[PDB]
Write a protein that binds this ligand. Structure first.
Ligand SMILES: CCCCCCCCCC(=O)NS(=O)(=O)OC[C@H]1O[C@@H](n2cnc3c(N)ncnc32)[C@H](O)[C@@H]1O
Ligand SMILES: CCCCCCCCCC(=O)NS(=O)(=O)OC[C@H]1O[C@@H](n2cnc3c(N)ncnc32)[C@H](O)[C@@H]1O
Ligand SMILES: CCCCCCCCCC(=O)NS(=O)(=O)OC[C@H]1O[C@@H](n2cnc3c(N)ncnc32)[C@H](O)[C@@H]1O
Ligand SMILES: [Mg+2]
Ligand SMILES: [Mg+2]
Ligand SMILES: [Mg+2]
Lengths: 527, 527, 527
């Protein structure tokens, strides 16, 4: 450790922030409420407790928790002692969750009591975990008891900024969940990079030191988009809602005067459709919408409620944020219909992001508002590869750029607009489902000859899976029978819960290509 | 060059900014005006011209220029081809300037025609420079002609982010000017670090994308505090005033609607005292004051003009910015007298800066509002050492922290307040003078027995040098004779021009210590 | 490549064998029959075909095939060009097979047509495979057509002997299948090491140059125990039976005059129980029994048929062979009952194997015939770790020895006798099932409170799983309902086919320990 050789460490985000008010509050719904000074104490207590549990630098601590203060402490204390924080996506099927736990080789799992039923399905096949800390919202929490037995004093190590700080698994690709990891330097740069982008907005879409922060993106989803790191960096009041309940979320916005939040379009649809939201005041509330395309109708409805609603774009692989919608003063003077179109765009690339539209030959395409191609990016917060993966990692970084798998056109003013997907994947309410995997399960039916699963757009869910099934030579099976057939795979924890919204459309034939492959591009036009 | 191994390069500040409007203007006073798209073209043309002149990676290009568009292009094009940009402090004496040119081994000097008289004094003793490009504000500029002969196309190299990008020399220490250098990574982090700090301010002291930028800090002074990099990153309109004339500066603020600027307290004193400023409107003008302590009276006078005036602190060695004044909403509601006290503080440390108060034994002192000690800092943009210097570099980084040489107390809320200096140096209107060097010159007088030079505070200049001279056994020399004696050293280019404000006070004795050393701490109390 | 620096390469097993008769035959059941000279030609043709398909050194070629001549060519040609041969255990569930294909990142899969139904279950989730070569026992084989288009000339590379030659996955541990790998040097040493052991036997249990070899161990099971490499090294006639049919196997033994074979005890039980075997002559037939404990009754029945039947011991992790039964001339003169006891022992350690009995503290135990402990081994053909695995690899090599997970006592004469298992795993007919995984599936039943699965010994299957289920507070579910419940998991390809032999025994309570854990050691005594 050379003192002049500064390392970009997550501990510098905490102890060298943009602003620190020791009396500013971290609020956990209606369960807990303490100050930033207490939060710094609990990070050091957690670091002491982790050291006592034998967590060393390079160890993996897994977290299965809701959006809480404990998760925020996990964001700092675990990477800050040099350990790897593994955010377990609790919305995956138990079999997928078991894979990521064994693949990541977690030493300790901090699991909420409500996720214990998931554990009992896969506990026997977990071999790396030596300790389970059960998390509770009451005084009987094992995490809270571990912290109480520790001092609020800890000297956090200096290590290389390229130490891996966080890992998590995305199901956005084919096959098994892929592990993406991020270093301390990448997370620090992502915090400063996006703060420099959305902090410096003139009027609209600002994250500033006077904001009150409440995530409605799960903290296992690409670091809650990285906003808890930015919210801590700004020293703002942070409200953690726990398990997402629309009435609980709406009460927290009014009671804690939340001004900045973020979520997938499904959450905003649920928040705006709730009967209690009708009498609510949203004048000071800003929400950035990511994970899925923001519908113009949903953006318009939020605008009528005086919500500063704008869109953002990112990936698990890309330290999430790649582009955010920024409106010029001229664009802010437009009518609600014209404003809703700009606010629902994919967005302009954020600072230090090189986003290009290319074709299959990696040739860069002109940035007119019509020519479409895959988005390839270079940024200081991209995963260099998938964890313990070679061939898929090479495809991710083919041609020297990270491939997003998203087809988009970029206009003259830099506004990206995603048109469709390269990958044969469907995102439902923020969770991934693989069409090929869904086809395989539905093909296991005895009276099924061919299955083609496509993503049908949905106003509430974003996309829903549509299975176009060709019957056998003399087979007659109703559509709802296949839905019940696939439900049994969900009940066993093999298929994702989001396939419960699958629609089966029996068709006489499935359109193909001259080579014999299924033509899904032409298939979506017909249905 | 590994594509996934992102390098923090100054070319990423330009081509991956927070915002880019190709039709946004770069304005050079009343001489030139072009768009950001032209500015990017002229950077590539300059890169082509530098390549033709044989500038390679690792070469030093020196610039002797006013605050212009050419200097802004020098900020990018020279580091972006991997060359070292040397900002020559044209306010130093010609002998000091000659030292820094030979010490830095400049290959090419871009010198304005008005600085040619400085060159003719030291041209014979310059051995490393092979080409002089003369800069002119008219069409006869050699820099403009070099650019016209080049294409607007250039592929900027990828190199290590630890490549040195900028060098310049500070006279704030004893002895010869010391060379501080900064890498691409340090400059990029300084841009994002301070943008995350002042961009995210809620209301007061904001640098945002809607601002109009005009520096009144010279661009050879620690990168104009780094603001031109931040202004380019935000893609804002930039107004470069050229040579500082109070009427010209005031006209540019009104005509170009400047909203963000920065300067030393002397400049603000001159701007506010100008008769034309009385009828001017300063409602939208924000200026951050650094380099010297901001007097409460000057801050109050600016506040009566509705100027968002706040203070900042930094050094040549520290990538300048270490702390900036940020006001909470409660502090913004105070009266003008109470507000002027907070706005004139040294400030709260910026993001990623670890500022401590220590004693001579490097023991960290409590942060009460009374206990004073030297500020020692750790930050991602500090010079690791002085150029081609070992012993002074070790003292700069003694105890693992960079020593500022400034004595301060930090209060409970984190507000730093500088009390006095460790180093025996005096800063006059933003330029350094060494008391020991001034004593040596005045000691060369035949009728001088002892000389002690101390810095007397000044309302306009900040500090002025005061020489307390003890006469010889039977000598009688008037005070004004010594002032003329020292003026001859200035006319020869050996002593700094700022010593013209020296005051000689003949005293019967000079207070000393038990060890025999001069007691300057007790000496300032008496006079 | 230093010519004097000899590398132990699999190509030296082929082109520098103990004996080479160019007119000696490789027989594939009743489908194909060619000479050793043709076999060497087809290895070079396969090497040419693999080079044309773009297989480079370090690539993985996966094989899903029966015991054939093609598999024998795969044993040589794939490692001999420096590629990794992945032997896919086709008896695993499709989900397990999919895991090993994705974990190993196979580039090309050589799959028999009869295993294509397994592929269609998991084809959509396979991402690394670019080519499937379908294998057929007729002239329409894609492998045969690929070979016909190539020359019989190939210069095989010299590389480091530590190049990994073979990979395969064992399910003998908890969690996911673990990848064990072996280098060229390890495989060469395993061939010479065991040839020096069983070749030098005086009379009984000899593998010599006059033998006729027929494997009845699948070639995906630890290299068919390594015998095809040894059989090729000796240049003996090799008979490959394809898919195991008891009448087909018995016909090949009589028709091809097979003298040396090997199998699990279940196969020998099936061969001896077949009605056609009654009239067969087994005077010259030797078979070594591994994978499971050889019952004394089965050994005695084989001895009455004049079969030279002896036992051997090994693992997937241990290059299989660790110990083989060798009988002294005095032991060969004993009666059939006393001989059957010695022939059914675990065996004496083979050359270059250091086998020790230790306790949980890695303390070596005395080699009396009663004291039992875990077998830990050091040998020149052990896997150094599991593929892409750290924590499980450390447990495998805890204390500097490879842990077998087998409890045994070693007598004074060196005869090992395995008593029970450390790992909570059950082996059924040569395939592994995890008790904890079986408990988890049976625990998913709504009317199940506690499940404890233990391995009950079986005369035919070796071990069968026994589930002792404690009913809920007021639940009444029949035992056969749970068997049908678990069968559905098998039909979906999640649970192993070998769980079809599970027995459910409803019990009022499950014996536990003072710590609360299930006491399976005491549980097996009760049931
Ligand atoms: C200031 C925050 C602003 C940033 C928010 C977005 C971050 C979301 C992090 C996140 O979806 N990871 S993922 O691996 O679960 O999904 C990644 C995929 O989702 C899609 N997609 C994400 N955003 C989208 C958007 N605005 N419009 C349309 N499509 C969007 C897209 O196909 C991505 O490739
Ligand atoms: C957003 C910009 C806000 C940052 C402006 C300050 C940067 C000035 C960069 C710069 O003075 N370098 S130097 O080497 O020529 O001088 C360095 C010395 O000057 C003194 N000193 C600088 N600031 C001061 C301040 N606010 N109050 C009091 N004393 C101040 C101090 O003794 C430093 O050690
Ligand atoms: C000349 C050949 C002579 C060598 C034949 C044995 C090689 C078998 C290669 C093979 O079982 N791998 S495994 O990973 O599928 O199983 C490994 C486990 O099986 C058990 N076990 C293997 N043999 C056994 C035996 N003779 N008596 C009793 N128990 C035996 C034992 O618990 C092992 O740990
Ligand atoms: Mg993703
Ligand atoms: Mg300085
Ligand atoms: Mg094994």
């Amino acid at each position: 450790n050379d003192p002049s050789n500064y390392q970009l460490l997550i501990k510098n985000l905490l102890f060298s922030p943009v602003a620190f008010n020791p009396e500013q509050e971290i609020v956990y719904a209606n369960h807990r409420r303490h100050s930033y000074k207490t939060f710094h104490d609990r990070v050091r207590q957690f670091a002491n407790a982790l050291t006592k549990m034998g967590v060393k630098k390079g160890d993996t601590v897994a977290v299965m928790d809701y959006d809480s203060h404990r998760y925020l402490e996990c964001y700092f204390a675990i990477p800050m002692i040099g350990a790897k924080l593994h955010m377990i996506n609790v919305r995956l099927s138990p079999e997928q969750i078991l894979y990521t736990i064994d693949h990541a080789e977690d030493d300790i799992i901090l699991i909420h009591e409500e996720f214990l039923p998931i554990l009992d399905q896969i506990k026997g096949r977990i071999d790396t975990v030596t300790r389970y800390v059960v998390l509770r919202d009451d005084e009987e929490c094992e995490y809270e008891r571990l912290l109480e037995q520790e001092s609020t004093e800890y000297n956090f190590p200096d290590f290389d900024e390229n130490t891996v700080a966080t890992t998590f698994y995305t199901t956005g690709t084919t096959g098994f969940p892929k592990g993406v990891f991020f270093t301390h330097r990448q997370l620090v740069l992502h915090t400063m990079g996006i703060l420099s982008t959305i902090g410096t907005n003139a009027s609209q879409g600002r994250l500033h030191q006077g904001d009150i922060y409440m995530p409605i993106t799960p903290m296992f989803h690409v670091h809650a988009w990285g906003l808890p790191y930015m919210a801590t960096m700004l020293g703002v009041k942070q409200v953690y809602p726990g398990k997402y309940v629309p009435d609980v979320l709406l009460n927290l916005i009014e009671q804690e005067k939340v001004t900045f939040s973020h979520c997938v379009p499904t959450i905003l649809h649920l928040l705006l459709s709730s009967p209690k939201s009708k009498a609510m005041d949203f004048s000071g509330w800003k929400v950035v919408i990511g994970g899925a395309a923001l519908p113009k109708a949903l953006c318009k409805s939020a605008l009528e409620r005086d919500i500063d609603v704008f869109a953002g774009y990112g990936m698990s692989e890309t330290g999430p944020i790649l582009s955010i919608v920024q409106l010029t003063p001229e664009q802010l003077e437009l009518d609600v219909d014209q404003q809703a179109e700009y606010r629902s765009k994919t967005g302009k690339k954020v600072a230090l992001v090189e986003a290009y539209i290319v074709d299959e030959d990696m040739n860069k395409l002109p940035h007119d508002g019509e020519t479409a191609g895959e988005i390839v990016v270079r940024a200081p917060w991209l995963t260099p590869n998938y964890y313990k993966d070679n061939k898929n990692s090479k495809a991710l970084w083919r041609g020297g750029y990270l491939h997003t798998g998203d087809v988009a056109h970029i206009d003259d003013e830099g506004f990206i607009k995603i048109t469709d997907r390269v990958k044969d994947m469907i995102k439902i309410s923020g969770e991934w489902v693989s069409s090929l995997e869904l086809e395989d399960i539905l093909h296991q039916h005895q009276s099924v000859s061919e299955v083609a699963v496509i993503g049908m757009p949905h106003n509430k869910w974003g996309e829903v899976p549509l299975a176009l099934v060709t019957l056998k030579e003399d087979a007659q099976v109703t559509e709802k029978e296949l839905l019940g057939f696939a439900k049994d795979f969900i009940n066993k924890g093999i298929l994702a819960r989001e396939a419960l919204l699958l629609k089966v459309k029996i068709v006489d034939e499935i359109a193909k290509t001259s080579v014999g492959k299924v033509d899904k591009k032409e298939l979506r036009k017909l249905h």
